Amino acid sequence: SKGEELFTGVVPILVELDGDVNGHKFSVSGEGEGDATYGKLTLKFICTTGKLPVPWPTLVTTFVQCFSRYPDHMKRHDFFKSAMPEGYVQERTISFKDDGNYKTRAEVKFEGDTLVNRIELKGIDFKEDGNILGHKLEYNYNSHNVYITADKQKNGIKANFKIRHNIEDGSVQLADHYQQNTPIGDGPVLLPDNHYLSTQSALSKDPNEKRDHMVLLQFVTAAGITH
Ligand SMILES: [Mg+2]
Ligand SMILES: [Mg+2]
């Protein structure tokens, strides 16, 4: 298909986010590459405004599910690649249990041969010394299942999942995710049967990088459909 064919090799990625969380305004730029053949992502993000005012882990899901590996027998269920190159809008509400929420609106599309994710993020209702604004979350990341369903009147998809952020005291900060995706272009997209994406992520630091930053290595496989 046109869209899937754009992902058979290594594709460079750019991420650009502007955020406002409880009036703390910040921006992040990221770069790296994806290899959807292996479900593989490598990205490095820089906060360009100084110190990031929320913990890096809380932004991982916001910072390109077209790089998930869809098994061959599941090709017909890959909405994300089918919207390319024109792209899709991706919107979420991320509800941090007993704390505030993020609302995000992003557009994921090609600019030339580069896959771009441009995001606007708004966070409200955060506690000044909760786990987010108080920076109480460990610098690590768990493995999740992203449950996808068709959203036929939008010509797109929805997703619902729970992200678990470990807290430095050993507890966990839940971040409920609700997601909607809508194609931007006029080409045919794929409306999938129910399925999920199996995720795993590893966070690290670049020892020579003195700006506030995050290095992310991520592997994602679509699953839940046998034939
Ligand atoms: Mg720049
Ligand atoms: Mg079917």
Numbering used by the authors: 2 to 64, 68 to 231
What did the authors write?
On the other hand, the E222Q variant maintains the chromophore in the anionic state by replacing Glu222 with a neutral glutamine. In the present work, we applied charge-density analysis to the E222Q variant in order to reveal the kind of interactions that effectively regulate the electronic state of the chromophore. Consequently, the total negative charge of the chromophore (−1.05) is allocated to both the phenolate and imidazolinone moieties. The negative charges determined at both Oη and O2 of the chromophore of the E222Q variant indicate that the chromophore is in a resonant structure between the phenolate and quinone forms.
Green fluorescent protein (GFP), which was discovered in the jellyfish Aequorea victoria, is a light-emitting protein consisting of 238 amino acids.
